[PDB]
Subunit: 116 residues, 4 copies
């Protein structure tokens, strides 16, 4: 599992469960091609998005659907989504964890990158 | 001034100076149309992007060119850029400040929406 | 004004208004001596805490009374208060801004140190 | 394990390893009594600080020695340490994860609180 997403809720002090995540990859013609998607589990984690073989070098966008999360909880938030855009695997395969901490009018995202 | 951008540097403990910022508005065909842009000042701020007349309700994207900022400082960063995507609403308060606090592998953004 | 405190609310997307802030200086016996205090203004800021003459090198603690803030808004918070502990140094720039961004179960603090 | 500490480094995009952590508990006479201490592992985690029996109700302070972390890496940071102060177990036993994301002039801390 070379791409994992972890989401926390800063209002409840809990994992952010059932958060939809869509990953895109920049194609040769410079558009955002859909790459993988999923939703966070009861632990606020999303595993199984892709494989080492399919997660080739490229520029990736991880869109975390924060508005859809907050609205399903009946709250009106500020952002449409949190976007995390990065070049991956350009020095060989790595494992990436994208973490996000959510509030209704704010979020903070960090990457943990490890070398198998 | 209905839209301001403030950028801080969490490594140096300073404003983030001369950071390029591009603002886009979502068009009817879901493409991102250029709207306004500039570079942050010595105080890490970018004022004068738009006017109340032009800043109508809709979805906007503020792209902060963090990669160039870190590279100019000789530091290797993670993100291509920081992105802040939000709906402008006339119901709420009138002035939007988008603030971003930058680290090489992490950022933190909030909205301060006031009258 | 060598020391300013700025407090933001990440739930409401606003300055955090009327938040009590207490600043202490570490004494020779390692106790915390009261130094200055106030409440944030309508812009979430607290100015006028000290003077350049009084703000000598040393270790300071800025305590932000976040628990009372959240309770006044009818929200149940995690932390008793937010604490920012740092050394003032004459070598670096002259003006310290301690900023804090508050959520019920989380905060984010940075220092903006300028001339 | 009812009290766990997780620390990340926002400069390196990695766990913050070998970070010293000291936990204190407010005593009846209102001073900070030493309660437990340890240091983060290669995964940036600190387990085994206390037990369910010993982690009674009280006000706790988790001091994360960020200055000692940054200086051991040869960098001069702003804060002395990050302090996380909270009432614990006042509605019965809970499990607490205190997470912190570190930069030289900034940090962000969050709590994840779960009910066994
Ligand atoms: O830089 S200043 O001295 O102007 O002080 C300010 C003024 C201001 O509007 C905002 C801020 C800080 C915002 C901020 C944003 C995200 C975080 O995770 C933490 C803090 C600091
Ligand atoms: O507390 S947990 O059990 O969720 O453990 C984890 C695991 C993990 O990959 C990340 C985190 C915290 C990340 C985090 C991210 C951004 C912030 O501004 C503050 C904290 C916490």
């Amino acid at each position: 599992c070379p791409l994992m997403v972890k989401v926390l809720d800063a209002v409840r002090g809990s994992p952010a469960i059932n958060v939809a995540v869509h990953v895109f990859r920049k194609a040769a013609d410079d558009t955002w091609e859909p790459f993988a998607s999923g939703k966070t589990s009861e632990s606020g984690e999303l595993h199984g998005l892709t494989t080492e073989e399919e997660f080739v070098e490229g520029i990736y966008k991880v869109e975390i659907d924060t508005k859809s999360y907050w609205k399903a909880l009946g709250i009106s938030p500020f952002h449409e989504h949190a976007e995390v855009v990065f070049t991956a695997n350009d020095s060989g395969p790595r494992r990436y964890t994208i973490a996000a901490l959510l509030s209704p009018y704010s979020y903070s995202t960090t990457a943990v990158v490890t070398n198998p």
